[PDB]
Nucleic acid binder design. Structure first.
Ligand code: MG
Ligand code: MG
Ligand code: MG
Ligand code: ZN
Lengths: 361, 68, 38
RNA sequence: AGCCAGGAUGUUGGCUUAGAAGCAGCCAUCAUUUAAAGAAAGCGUAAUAGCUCACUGGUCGAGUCGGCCUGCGCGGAAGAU
RNA sequence: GCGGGGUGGAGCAGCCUGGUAGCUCGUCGGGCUCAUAACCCGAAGGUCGUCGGUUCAAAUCCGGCCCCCGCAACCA
């Protein structure tokens, strides 16, 4: 009974948090404004505007109608639970439990969408850990982070495989790439991207001075390889002509040199090494395919380089979470969430920070 | 009279019952309930014999997906 | 006018008519259906 | 063939959809009013609507339909004194 | 067109002549050290590119297919 009341209060807080994160008053006002616009005849004068307003009204209606139905369901469940508890009706109690479970599943579906709106949140992920300023201490700290993340993945039931792991010579690991597989693994892990600051008594310094070390965790989603596309012949212009320095009656007369131009891109390849126009055309086709592939690889490498440039320097100012063991405090700078059970967090109790970050969005 | 489909849903106690009807039955209704539903709409319904109205409502429910 | 080798009735309003030794499809409903064999 | 009537009801069958009313589909696809009227064959509407049409009645009064085998033809069919 | 190759994680042997996989580094465990390297003592790891054939039996012999190399590609 009391756990059921606690569940009801948690669902009430969850619904209020959903309403406030979504600004239910703002969404309701926007929906009413869209309704007024749509009732006005001039709304359909622009078909794109009318369809946009219809889609917006459908989304706002989903959210608003779901919340309006959910509030009433919770109130009704509360009343039915009061009646069942008062009358000592076990069947009604079980029915209320089933209804509360169904409503909790509904709210959980809504809050799951809210937590993972992102397109790739459902994909598996890769986690890269790199040591930073601490040197050997940073490498040790990176190994500790790797252990923590593996333990958290095991808690969540994901499957992990070390793609690679460079080990520091004195201690720890310089770097590690880990593959995490599971349901919304990238969604759950993406908020952990950043630099992690560690403060303790350096277990390497001879004097045991209180030092600071940094380690970076970078999470990126697993990506399917690009489907190869055949070069559409309609996209190519082929020119045959005489080769330069043509020596002899035959060579002067024959059109052996081939040039292929990709109309969409403008990239041109040319071959005239062989006496046969067919061989030259085949080689030029190979070169054109290679050049298109090289262009796409160059674009992908440019995006990767942009990600590398964007990555926060693993240094003294950049930190998403601070783990001070001497003070026995762990604080997330972004969300403000603070804990004192450093041992539990290092053993893998990251759900507090991860859930807080997802809720904050 | 109010539309028949909403009354059918109300009698059932189901919300969505049309997806893949013959492949797997989502809901099911009883004939007596259908007949009781029919008799209330007799003012607007086009017929004298209530039996015809009842079987018409049965067919409507079958189209909706719920097997009688 | 679609000029092609295979001229056919595309809807129920199309009619096959031979004018001056040429098969033509004239449609009272859809101007796109107008065809000439050639 | 035209031509004249008609060409209904539950019911917009429900879902998924943004909307889905025969006519995006999915998806069932029935019974009722009977002369007959499709949970629609096409056109059409953002959706309806609307336009047909299938079906059926009534006037006119001899053919009409669309396959099979076969003879001969027609298009497809643009080149450099 | 004519020649070569593809074998523990890396580089090389073993093929010829069918029966049997080696070396060096690397990896792992224990030592030494305050600790790391070096060093010392032990271990593990390749069913031989991929299919097929031949054979009692194939890394080995034969034939495809894939990858990599060389050459050759002329008068014209
Ligand atoms: Mg001819
Ligand atoms: Mg052997
Ligand atoms: Mg020469
Ligand atoms: Zn037509």
């Amino acid at each position: 009974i009391n756990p059921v009341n606690n569940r009801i209060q948690d669902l009430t807080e969850r619904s209020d948090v959903l309403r406030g994160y979504l600004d239910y008053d703002a969404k309701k006002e926007r929906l009413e404004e869209v309704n007024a616009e749509l009732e006005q005849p001039d709304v359909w004068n622009e078909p794109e505007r009318a369809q946009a307003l219809g889609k917006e009204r459908s989304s706002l209606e989903a959210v608003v109608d779901t919340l309006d139905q959910m509030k009433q369901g919770l109130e009704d469940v509360s009343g039915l639970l009061e009646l069942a508890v008062e009358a000592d009706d076990e069947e009604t109690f079980n029915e209320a439990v089933a209804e509360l479970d169904a409503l909790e599943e509904k709210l959980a579906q809504l809050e799951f969408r809210r937590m993972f709106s992102g397109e790739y949140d459902s994909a598996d992920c890769y986690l890269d850990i790199q040591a930073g300023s601490g040197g050997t201490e940073a490498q040790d700290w990176a190994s500790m982070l790797e252990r923590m993340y593996l333990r958290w993945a095991e808690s969540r039931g994901f499957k992990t495989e070390i793609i690679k792991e460079s080990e520091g010579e004195v201690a720890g690991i310089k770097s590690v790439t880990i593959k995490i597989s599971g349901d919304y693994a990238y969604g759950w892990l993406r908020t952990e991207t950043g630099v992690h600051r560690l403060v303790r008594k350096s277990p390497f310094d001879s004097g045991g001075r209180r030092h600071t070390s940094f380690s970076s965790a970078f999470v990126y989603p697993e990506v399917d390889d690009d489907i190869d596309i055949e070069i559409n012949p309609a996209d190519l212009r082929i020119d045959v002509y005489r080769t330069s320095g043509a020596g002899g009656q035959h060579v002067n007369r024959t059109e052996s040199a081939v040039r292929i131009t990709h109309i969409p891109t403008g990239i041109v390849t040319q071959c005239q090494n062989d006496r046969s126009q067919h061989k030259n055309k085949d080689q030029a086709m190979k070169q054109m395919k290679a050049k298109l592939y090289e262009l796409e690889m160059q674009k992908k490498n440019a995006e990767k380089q942009a990600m590398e440039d964007n990555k926060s320097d693993i240094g003294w100012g950049s930190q998403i979470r601070s783990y001070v063991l001497d003070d026995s405090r762990i604080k997330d700078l972004r969300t403000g969430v603070e804990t004192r059970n450093t041992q539990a967090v290092l053993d893998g109790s990251l759900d507090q920070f991860i859930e807080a970050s997802l809720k904050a969005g | 009279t109010p539309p028949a489909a909403v009354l059918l849903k109300k009698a059932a106690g189901i919300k969505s019952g049309s997806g893949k009807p013959n492949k797997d039955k989502v809901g099911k209704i009883s004939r007596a309930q259908l007949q009781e539903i029919a008799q209330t709409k007799a003012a607007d319904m086009t017929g004298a014999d209530i039996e015809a109205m009842t079987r018409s409502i049965e067919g409507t429910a079958r189209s909706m997906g719920l097997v009688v | 006018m679609k000029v092609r080798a295979s001229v056919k009735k595309l809807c129920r309003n199309c009619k096959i008519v031979k004018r001056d030794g040429v098969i033509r499809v004239i449609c009272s409903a859809e101007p796109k259906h107008k065809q000439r064999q050639g």
